[PDB]
Write a protein that binds this DNA or RNA. Structure first.
Ligand SMILES: [K+]
Ligand SMILES: [Mg+2]
Ligand SMILES: [Mg+2]
Ligand SMILES: [Mg+2]
Ligand SMILES: [Mg+2]
Ligand SMILES: [Mg+2]
Ligand SMILES: [Mg+2]
Ligand SMILES: [Mg+2]
Ligand SMILES: [Mg+2]
Lengths: 134, 80, 80, 88
RNA sequence: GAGAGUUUGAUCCUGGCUCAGGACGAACGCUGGCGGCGUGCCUAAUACAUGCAAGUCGAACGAACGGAUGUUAGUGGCGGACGGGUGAGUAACACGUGGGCAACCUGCCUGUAAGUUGGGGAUAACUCCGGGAAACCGGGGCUAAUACCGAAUGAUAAAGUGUGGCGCAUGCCACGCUUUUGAAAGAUGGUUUCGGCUAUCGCUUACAGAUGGGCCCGCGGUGCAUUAGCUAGUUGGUAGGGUAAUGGCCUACCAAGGCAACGAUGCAUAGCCGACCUGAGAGGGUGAUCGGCCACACUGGGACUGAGACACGGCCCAGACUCCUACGGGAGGCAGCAGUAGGGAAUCUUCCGCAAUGGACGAAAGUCUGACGGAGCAACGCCGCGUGUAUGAAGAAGGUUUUCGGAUCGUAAAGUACUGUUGUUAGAGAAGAACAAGGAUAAGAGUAACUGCUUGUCCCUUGACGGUAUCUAACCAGAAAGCCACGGCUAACUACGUGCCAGCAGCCGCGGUAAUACGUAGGUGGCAAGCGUUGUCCGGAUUUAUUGGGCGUAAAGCGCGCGCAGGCGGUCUUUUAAGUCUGAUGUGAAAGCCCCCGGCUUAACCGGGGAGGGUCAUUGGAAACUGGAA
């Protein structure tokens, strides 16, 4: 462009989207108005639990839970690891992370933080999946 | 209040208010006597200037008015 | 003495009473893309007698405030 | 008032002090008007550095010291000096 | 100034997505030994259970208590406006930087020059009365002052003026005459003769200064035009009043301006900066902690007091919300330190002391200070130290694996020798502390001289932390290692089990009976008292390209013109100095980055010194180029 063009309008960079929009919103009951606050993790209440058929190429059933977070946003969270404790009205803690197999999931459930009891029988990567040392 | 000294300063301040308000009102009734008499262009105004200036400078010494205000008021009155 | 600010410019209007408005017109550097930009800034000059006129080159200098907007004064009339 | 005093600096259980000019009102480590020396009590001779001409000046303007700053000045020979300048 | 992977059968380009680094006030998962330095409600400026955060002076005053000192509930003075908190609001002289005030204030501090003369009237406290559980309220009477109110003498305060020297229009500085105003207070202490005199702490007037504030101004720093008109005391003027002071600050009268595409008005957002993180740098993001400034103290408004407020822990009133009651009526505002609830992914002890530094009061002793020193908790971070050291084999038992010969865990162990950073036990035990006050004295100015004041030197003195650090010995390898990954990107491979199931995954992608990609075991790699994941910021990303990109076919030339505004503009001479360039002065705080020294057992950390940083301003110069002019 010409310099006069660049002065009449300077540049404008790209509008960045977050991987994790719902972690980046807080709530106050008083105002009843969402408040932008960068957050790593949120807790919620499992509305629904179920299985998913993932994309091509894959075919295994994937465990998800539809959660209502603390801030009121309804979110689908993958339940990683072998087996789980969860059911309806179960409280859950939620971190970000995208299940590439599965279309509508963008977040994971931290395993071992709350009523998400740790995985059974696991020995390796225990800090993930939330088993104590035996 | 709730501190021992706050109630004391409320007392002190109401007292000082009563006093300094009386003194201001007297000053200003003086100044109005002067300006009315000067509007009427009478004989008494030349003593009333003095009465007003006495009370202005006395108010200064009592602290209820600042000296540039007193000076300015003497100036504006003298201008009548 | 300490010294005051002085500027030069051009007159745009005369409708006001005993004053004018002097527009100063300076090139200056755009902060990022480096080009020179015509920066303009008008001030109210205190014209003691409605001397100047529209189209007049003029010099002004600052002083105490004289109205809501004025802070300057006519110093010379450099060129009609 | 305007005072000549100590500004606490350094770290915990190892203090150091700047010798400072300041109002009574301002904070202990807040702003100042001019700093004119330093102090350290840890060492066997306490280590003082003072400019002494600005210090005489601030005293002539009426900046009074603290107790310990006064006695630092006196053990540096500055309070005798200031009395000597008050002699005339 | 490093790049790598991913589109294709393959290639080149384009283009996106991700990754290798660095940083967090972080959270979470697994685990967890210590020391030093730091940091710790970012969310609900949501609500407050409780406790303590602003008191002091008996050398201002009167009463009461008391066997002369001392104490007090009151009147009075000073301080409560500092210190401390938070970032709600705020897009503006709020902030930064640089100036201006001939248009302005300033208690306490210093110094200079004068002066504290005489009187008066009350009022609390107190005592009674009535009310009220009682506090506490009224009504009567008594009373002191450094509380109040008069006067005389004194204005560099006004008014009338005249002279000198000047500035930047409004005007300033100095001098002198006339007229009119404006003050006060004592307390302690000594001496003297008894009148007197007199030091200090105070008081009053003026002047200077310093310090602290106030007003104005140039410029600078945010997105939106799916917001273009806005304003009506709004703009200027003549008069008037008002403020510490200029000014539509306000009022009356006159004219109808003024601002604005150089983005006004409006909406949403936000405290601003020093600086912090990143980056080759330009720049990008942030405005935790530290310092400065601003704003606000449940919300709104208003004043009084005072040098200073329109006041965090003051007042009044309205509103919300809450508490106690004897049910008549009262009281209150944690964004002070701790703490509690709630919210939240999430953030501390209802701790000690004023020994220190600093502030308020006081003549001072001293008192007060949740400022501040410290200690406590949290692996939250940075640094440091360990959790043994040596020697010890063709190589134990065992595990894994086996091409069943072996290979590996592995000098690891065992065994032998040694050490005690740490741990434990017993002993010692610094700094930080200066002083102040008081007692002695030596010299001064000032005194009739003493008292006193100022200064010199001695003596004396008081530590929360804390019997903490530190140091000595003795005893023990003893009690002190876990997390992640191992297909490529990228360091590090085998066995079993499973069989597009269970499950993995930052991108590409693995798993359908022979899986280095899932789970487990062994072994390995990377780190290590932390490791990893998630969230956010920069870079890499030349992917908003000023430095530093592009539009034939990839995204991208309005379908084309007429043209206001703006941007840009042929050759030469003179003139200037708007822009440019340049010498000087001043400033851009400290802390932080950077460099050089020093100190903590090094480090982190801390100190000293220097440097840097501005489209900074004034002043003085050049005319080559842009701009203005002929
Ligand atoms: K206005
Ligand atoms: Mg805000
Ligand atoms: Mg770059
Ligand atoms: Mg207050
Ligand atoms: Mg409070
Ligand atoms: Mg609190
Ligand atoms: Mg297999
Ligand atoms: Mg195309
Ligand atoms: Mg600096």
């Amino acid at each position: 462009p010409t310099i006069n063009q660049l002065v009449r309008k300077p540049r404008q960079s790209k509008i960045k989207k977050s991987t994790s929009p719902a972690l980046n919103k807080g709530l106050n009951s008083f105002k009843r108005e969402l408040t932008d606050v960068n957050s790593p993790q949120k807790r919620g209440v499992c509305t629904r639990v179920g299985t998913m058929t993932p994309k091509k190429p894959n075919s295994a059933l994937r465990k998800y839970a539809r959660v209502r977070l603390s801030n009121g946003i309804e979110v689908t969270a993958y339940i990683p690891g072998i087996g789980h404790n969860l059911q309806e009205h179960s409280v859950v803690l939620i971190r970000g992370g995208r299940v590439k197999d599965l279309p509508g999931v963008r977040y994971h459930i931290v395993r071992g933080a709350l009523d998400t009891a740790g995985v059974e029988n696991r020995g390796q990567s225990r800090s993930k999946y939330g088993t104590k040392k035996p | 209040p709730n501190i021992k000294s706050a109630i004391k300063r409320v007392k002190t301040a109401e007292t000082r208010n009563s006093r300094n308000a009386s003194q201001r009102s007297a000053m200003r009734t003086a100044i109005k006597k002067f300006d009315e008499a000067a509007a009427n262009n009478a004989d008494n105004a030349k003593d009333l200037y003095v009465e007003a200036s006495k009370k202005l400078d006395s108010a200064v010494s009592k602290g209820l008015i600042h000296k540039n205000n007193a000076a300015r008021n003497k100036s504006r009155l003298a201008a009548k | 003495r300490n010294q005051r600010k002085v500027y030069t410019g051009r007159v745009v209007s005369d409708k006001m009473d005993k004053t004018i408005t002097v527009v100063v017109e300076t090139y200056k550097k755009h902060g990022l893309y480096g080009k020179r930009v015509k920066y303009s800034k008008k001030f109210k000059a205190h014209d003691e007698n409605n001397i100047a006129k529209t189209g007049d080159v003029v010099r002004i200098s600052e002083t105490r405030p004289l109205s809501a907007t004025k802070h300057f004064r006519l110093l010379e009339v450099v060129e009609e | 008032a305007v005072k000549i005093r100590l500004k606490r600096i350094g770290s915990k259980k190892k203090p150091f002090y700047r010798i400072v000019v300041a109002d009574s009102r301002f904070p202990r480590d807040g702003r100042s008007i001019e700093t004119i020396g330093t102090y350290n009590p840890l060492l066997d001779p306490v280590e003082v550095k003072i400019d002494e001409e600005a210090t005489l000046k601030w005293m002539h303007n009426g900046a009074k010291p603290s107790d310990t700053v006064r006695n630092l000045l006196s053990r540096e020979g500055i309070m005798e000096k200031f009395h000597n300048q008050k002699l005339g």
